[PDB]
Amino acid sequence: AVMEAEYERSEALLANMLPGSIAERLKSSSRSVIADKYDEVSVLFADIVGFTERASTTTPADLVRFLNRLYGAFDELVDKHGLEKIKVSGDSYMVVSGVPRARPDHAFALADFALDMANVAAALKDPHGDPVPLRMGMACGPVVAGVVGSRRFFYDVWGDAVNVASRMESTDSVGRIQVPEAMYERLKNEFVLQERGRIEVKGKGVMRTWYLIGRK
Amino acid sequence: AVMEAEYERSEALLANMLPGSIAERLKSSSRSVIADKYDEVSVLFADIVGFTERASTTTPADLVRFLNRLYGAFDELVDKHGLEKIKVSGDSYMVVSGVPRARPDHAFALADFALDMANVAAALKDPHGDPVPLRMGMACGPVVAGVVGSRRFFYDVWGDAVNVASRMESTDSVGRIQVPEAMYERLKNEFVLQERGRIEVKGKGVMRTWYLIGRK
Numbered sequence: 452a453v454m455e456a457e458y459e460r461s462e463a464l465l466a467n468m469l470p471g472s473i474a475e476r477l478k479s480s481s482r483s484v485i486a487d488k489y490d491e492v493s494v495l496f497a498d499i500v501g502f503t504e505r506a507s508t509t510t511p512a513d514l515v516r517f518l519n520r521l522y523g524a525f526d527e528l529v530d531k532h533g534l535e536k537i538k539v540s541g542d543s544y545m546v547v548s549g550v551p552r553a554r555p556d557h558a559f560a561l562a563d564f565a566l567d568m569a570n571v572a573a574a575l576k577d578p579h580g581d582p583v584p585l586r587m588g589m590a591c592g593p594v595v596a597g598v599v600g601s602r603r604f605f606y607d608v609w610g611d612a613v614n615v616a617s618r619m620e621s622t623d624s625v626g627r628i629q630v631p632e633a634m635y636e637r638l639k640n641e642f643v644l645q646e647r648g649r650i651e652v653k654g655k656g657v658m659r660t661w662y663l664i665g666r667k
Numbered sequence: 668a669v670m671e672a673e674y675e676r677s678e679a680l681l682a683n684m685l686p687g688s689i690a691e692r693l694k695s696s697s698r699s700v701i702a703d704k705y706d707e708v709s710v711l712f713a714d715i716v717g718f719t720e721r722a723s724t725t726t727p728a729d730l731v732r733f734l735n736r737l738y739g740a741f742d743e744l745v746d747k748h749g750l751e752k753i754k755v756s757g758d759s760y761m762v763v764s765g766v767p768r769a770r771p772d773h774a775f776a777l778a779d780f781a782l783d784m785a786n787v788a789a790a791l792k793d794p795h796g797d798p799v800p801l802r803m804g805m806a807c808g809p810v811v812a813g814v815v816g817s818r819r820f821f822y823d824v825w826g827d828a829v830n831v832a833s834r835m836e837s838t839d840s841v842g843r844i845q846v847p848e849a850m851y852e853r854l855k856n857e858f859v860l861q862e863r864g865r866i867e868v869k870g871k872g873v874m875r876t877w878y879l880i881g882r883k
């Protein structure tokens with residue numbers, strides 16, 4: 452009986468770290484590599500503005516604790532919208548819509564998620580009592596998802612979509628949700644958007660950028 | 668009988684994904700943040716040069732299989748040196764020296780590892796037949812190592828050192844190991860170092876940087 456409550460603890464943690472399907476895949480003995488092509492997924496990057504500056508007022512341990520509190524809020528939100536959190540690179544938080552079950556409304560869900568996230572972040576304050584500014588940028592396109600390496604692995608996504616969302620985040624103005632022109636073309640029918648214009652993005656040149664404002 | 672076999676695969680997967688002690692800490696009902704202070708550790712960042720362009724000549728999933736091959740070789744090299752692999756995120760590979768057990772020779776061991784890694788990578792070729800260039804950066808200092816957020820728990824390490832180790836990689840010239848002055852002072856007695864000079868790093872200002880050339 453205690454064998455099955457430790458198995459329960461173990462299965463719950465395993466389910467927490469990998470998507471069910473990927474976990475099932477690893478539990479088989481398939482020496483084959485996990486690498487799946489997906490035609491159309493949407494990817495969002497969120498990054499706190501001017502984080503290393505908080506190194507003056509907060510200790511490193513209180514900065515990790517702040518991260519854990521804030522990402523607990525966002526995590527609660529990816530469960531609410533039922534989207535896929537991939538990873539966290541220190542200050543960035545990555546959410547993907549369309550993996551591993553693709554859905555046709557991925558672009559809309561990641562749009563709603565983005566807006567919902569924004570309000571929530573506006574509501575939080577950093578450990579020193581100041582607001583938490585976010586740069587957010589999203590994108591859509593083809594992606595490869597899978598697992599690399601033998602230990603310390605996770606489910607990761609790579610692709611053209613993650614590159615141009617990355618650029619939408621790095622080049623965003625604070626507190627705004629930047630979308631590229633192809634996702635604007637996809638979103639203009641249910642969301643309100645305001646043009647930002649031409650921007651230079653590394654590896655892609657210059658493209659049109661729009662701001663996500665709210666629902667129609 | 669099958670409910671101890673499934674449990675054996677499940678615990679085994681959990682074994683490879685997390686440090687043992689962290690697995691149990693996550694399985695307990697501790698409401699406390701998993702954040703352990705470590706005094707002196709060194710962090711290495713490696714990133715492949717011009718990886719996105721290879722999508723022209725190789726299909727995306729074959730690149731995942733290559734990635735998995737290259738980073739598998741590196742995982743072997745960290746067992747050889749007895750260091751701590753943290754993660755591989757897209758193109759990036761982070762190794763830590765000094766956790767969980769600190770060693771007086773942590774910076775020397777991560778220096779030898781950087782060099783051994785550069786030789787193994789110089790010997791390898793991409794699926795298209797071209798070389799694989801790396802950008803490498805190292806740093807040492809105090810680190811908070813742990814798990815943040817409520818879904819997709821990953822054992823990660825944070826701090827000033829990881830910040831400047833990333834800046835040392837992203838700002839490096841290809842095929843070189845950029846280290847800042849605080850590590851140059853540490854290594855200069857057993858390694859050969861060549862000054863690159865003063866460069867601007869976000870969140871740190873301007874720092875004098877050195878290249879690790881080889882063992883004395």
Ligand SMILES: CNc1ccccc1C(=O)O[C@H]1[C@@H](O)[C@H](n2cnc3c(=O)[nH]c(N)nc32)O[C@@H]1COP(=O)(O)OP(=O)(O)OP(=O)(O)O
Nearest residue numbers: 500501502503506511514540541542824825826827829830
């Ligand atoms: C003293 N610095 C810290 C103390 C405790 C915890 C974290 C840090 C810290 O420096 O985190 C930074 C990265 O090391 C840390 N970190 C970043 N990427 C990674 C990563 O990939 N892995 C790990 N383990 N840590 C990472 O994120 C932080 C922000 O880096 P940004 O590039 O986002 O700069 P910024 O200050 O936000 O201004 P801007 O981004 O708006 O331009």
Ligand SMILES: CNc1ccccc1C(=O)O[C@H]1[C@@H](O)[C@H](n2cnc3c(=O)[nH]c(N)nc32)O[C@@H]1COP(=O)(O)OP(=O)(O)OP(=O)(O)O
Nearest residue numbers: 608609610611613617715716717718719722727730757758
């Ligand atoms: C269409 N491109 C691909 C096809 C198949 C598999 C991977 C890719 C691919 O683009 O991988 C990159 C990200 O999509 C993907 N990526 C995945 N997650 C992330 C992420 O979280 N942040 C960023 N910036 N990139 C990510 O892994 C790679 C990160 O690449 P870099 O930004 O380092 O570009 P580079 O070519 O090495 O240029 P440079 O090093 O000389 O500057």
Ligand SMILES: [Mn+2]
Nearest residue numbers: 498499502542
């Ligand atoms: Mn930031």
Ligand SMILES: [Mn+2]
Nearest residue numbers: 498541542543
């Ligand atoms: Mn960041």
Ligand SMILES: [Mn+2]
Nearest residue numbers: 714757758759
């Ligand atoms: Mn990268």
